[PDB]
Design a protein around this ligand. Structure first.
Ligand SMILES: CN1[C@@H](CSCC(F)(F)F)Nc2cc(Cl)c(S(N)(=O)=O)cc2S1(=O)=O
Ligand SMILES: CN1[C@@H](CSCC(F)(F)F)Nc2cc(Cl)c(S(N)(=O)=O)cc2S1(=O)=O
Ligand code: NA
Ligand code: NA
Lengths: 475, 475
């Protein structure tokens, strides 16, 4: 019985798009489109995908240099800068993936808890819901992923169709002439007067700054290494990984642009929500854009004390849509898919690190064979860390450190491509057309600049952990 | 004719105390003693001298390992971590010393300009005074230092006696019962009631924070490598450098403690300066500590709008003193001595780098022999940079970068001592008693933590310059 291999659509493209897409697409992008306007949000998106396209070109070059087993993303780091950084960056990549599993399972459990709190009775605790649901969900994900990889691929296809159904739902919803309940909350159909007004920024609050929007959005656009972490499970990686990875980046970027430019042309930033703010003939005069449509939000705007509209309501995308439960289904398929992708990625990197003769730090973890063609000893190690960080359940002070563990890998991958190309390393002959050393160097510099520019003490902790591991291995 | 050698008093101790002592001793320490109180200022001082004592122990260990020529402070960095960091850290040490020459000559020229603006007519420009005076002063310093090193040593002894005379002046001044002019500005003799009141903090203003006081004070306590940069000009460095360096640190620390604890027991933080704030019998009641001595500063304290007292007047030390011109003489001897020490240090490191066969980057600078036993080609290179940065004359936005160039050297010296001691390097047998690897490691970590904690973008620029030099040498 031969093992199973995947094509470039179900092996690289679907996985990369599903790992890129998260809950920012549903819960924060329409709000970023309000704080910053349409054109400046487009600039945010295009500045964020510039780093990931350069990293994608370095990854595509690495893939056209030979055959690499699954989880060997750090082999060029260890081959170009020594096996003590390579193993340490591999061990920190695999740990960040396992903590990302917990950060996505917590996000799924929060949605389920909010869903339960509205329909019926919860359990006695408000925050132990997030713990029980998180543990049961990660155990179900572990079961499906440990039952083979065809089942994991079928689950990923299910999540992809759920997300496409949510997109079609929202797009049909924006085309229906408004009802009273929608129009009172700020939704008007595609209008020429709302497109123009929403093009320019309107900053409000403590985080209402261009750098704050960049900080919220940038970490969500990463996730382009999901198809390259299973390179040994593909029919032919040297054609699959470049094409799939770059098509995934292109199409997620187009979806991000279309959603912002269409939400910004339908919903005004301020609305009351109550049904008796229609025009009263002879009410002197009213101020606001919606007056010409028949609504009066003057009291809100003057007092700044109502909770609807594009800039006040985080759930505006769910109400523009034709049927609201399908957006919740999309959120489920967007968080579970990323948790599953991160779990598979962490398991395979851990399994590659446990069988590394040049990095013998953690090779002692295996006692039972677990020879069922699956990384059982990398699955249990990822599951243990994921459950431990789910029990904590408060992960918003740990997210910067985990997100800098991912930019250290980006910096070292790009610099290893540059260092191997300028030194004429003996055995580095990439055949990808659109690769160039100076682009890789720029990516390596920008990754570290962004690392320190997001939060400097988290960057210090990340580099300190890398250094402690590297020096403990040497001594 | 043999060359001249110096003992441990005139070669290490005087030079180190004169480079440590600057203008913070005269113009900012009495104000730090007001913002933070006596005990918390003592904590500031003892936390700052903890880093420099550990670095002094590493330097003393380096000095008891053989004979090193003058300027070879980076030889252990290059011997323990490769000749591409050693030369780069040497080249950045020598450049920071030459910029420090300009930062001290500008401080001398500012004092002379203020002195001239009060007595007579200046030249037509207010800021070109600082340029003409700076250039002429650095040329005179270059002349005396290029005329041999006995003359430089005699100038240093002159500066030391001037500083001691200023200290005796101030200490006699604090013991004289107050006059009307002094008592009106806030000076009362040693009182028990003012010691107690001044022990606890009183924060005011934007920089009135413990971290702000630390930021102002810490960079001034460094300067402990002035006696180790001329190690090849001493009778026997292996006994001279440890004893002199540690005695210098000890005595400058004791002077810093005594000045703060005696200025804090004499001057109240708020005073008016005008002579008719004495007690009027029957003026209801007055609020403040000085009332029991016969003065009334209620209007000031309520309105926060007068310019005398320990926390408002930067020149309080000059008015407590018996004769005021001697404090200005002390300021002259405190800035010129540091400029001369930095110029000699930069010249000798540049001359050691120009004769290095393992770091051939700048060995091309020498055409004329200049064989008069003096680093002529390291003197002219230091003089050119000093004059170029004096012409700019605005150096308070460059000081953080230059001050991080000095903490990078501290971090790499300490880490090179640790790395050589744990690896059992072949030829590293220090015979200093009070050396220990873990103290050196702690010093190396604390230096980088402080580097990033003072100002993170300046630390990024410093590490980026080091990295650019290191990588340009490798490729
Ligand atoms: C959305 N993710 C962000 C981190 S944001 C949440 C945080 F972890 F920061 F808390 N970065 C990456 C990067 C990669 Cl490369 C991969 S992956 N599976 O391709 O290797 C996965 C992720 S992610 O899914 O965790
Ligand atoms: C008072 N100085 C501070 C820097 S504060 C002013 C700034 F430069 F930051 F702008 N640090 C050092 C360190 C050393 Cl080691 C030496 S020296 N001659 O021993 O090598 C001299 C100096 S300093 O005199 O420049
Ligand atoms: Na997803
Ligand atoms: Na001095």
């Amino acid at each position: 019985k031969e093992p199973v291999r995947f094509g470039w659509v179900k092996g690289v493209m679907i996985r990369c798009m599903l790992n890129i897409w998260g809950v920012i697409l549903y819960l924060r992008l329409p709000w970023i489109t309000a704080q910053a306007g349409i054109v400046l949000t487009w600039i945010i998106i295009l500045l964020s995908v510039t780093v990931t396209s350069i990293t994608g070109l370095s990854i595509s070059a690495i893939s056209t240099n030979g055959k690499v087993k699954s989880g060997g993303t750090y082999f060029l780091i260890s081959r170009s800068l020594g096996p003590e950084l390579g193993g340490s960056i591999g061990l920190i990549f695999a740990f960040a993936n396992a903590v990302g599993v917990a950060m996505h399972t917590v996000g799924f459990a929060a949605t389920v808890r909010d869903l339960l709190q509205e329909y019926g009775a919860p359990i006695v605790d408000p925050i132990n819901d997030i713990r029980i649901i998180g543990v049961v969900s990660v155990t179900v994900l572990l079961a499906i992923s440990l039952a083979g990889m065809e089942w994991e691929s079928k689950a990923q296809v299910l999540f992809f169709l759920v997300i496409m159904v949510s997109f079609a739902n929202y797009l049909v919803g924006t085309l229906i002439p408004p009802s009273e309940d929608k129009a009172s909350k700020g939704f008007f159909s595609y209008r020429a007067d709302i497109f123009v007004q929403n093009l320019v920024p309107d900053w409000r609050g403590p985080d209402g700054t261009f750098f704050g929007m960049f900080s919220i959005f940038f970490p969500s656009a990463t996730g382009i290494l999901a198809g390259a972490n299973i390179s040994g499970d593909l029919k032919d990686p040297a054609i699959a990984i470049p094409k799939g990875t770059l098509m995934a980046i292109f199409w997620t970027t187009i979806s991000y642009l279309a959603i912002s430019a269409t939400i910004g042309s339908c919903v005004v930033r301020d609305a009351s929500g109550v049904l008796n703010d229609t025009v009263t003939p002879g009410w002197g005069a009213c101020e606001g854009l919606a007056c010409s449509y028949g609504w009066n939000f003057t009291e809100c705007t003057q007092q700044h004390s109502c909770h609807y509209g594009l800039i006040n309501y985080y759930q505006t995308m769910s109400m523009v849509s034709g049927f609201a439960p399908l957006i919740t289904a999309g959120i489920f398929g967007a968080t579970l898919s990323s948790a599953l992708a991160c779990l598979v990625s962490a398991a395979k990197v851990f399994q590659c690190l446990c069988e590394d003769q040049l990095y013998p730090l953690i090779g002692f973890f295996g006692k039972g064979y677990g020879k069922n063609k699956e990384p059982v000893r990398g699955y249990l190690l990822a599951y243990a860390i994921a459950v431990a960080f789910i029990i904590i359940a408060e992960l918003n002070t740990i997210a910067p450190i985990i997100s800098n563990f991912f930019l250290c890998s980006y910096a070292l991958i790009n610099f290893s491509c540059f260092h191997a190309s300028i030194t004429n390393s003996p055995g580095w002959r990439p055949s990808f057309q659109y690769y160039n050393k100076w682009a890789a160097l720029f990516g390596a510099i920008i990754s570290v600049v962004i690392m320190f520019l997001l939060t400097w003490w988290a960057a210090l902790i990340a580099i300190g952990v890398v250094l402690f591991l590297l020096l403990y291995v040497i001594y």
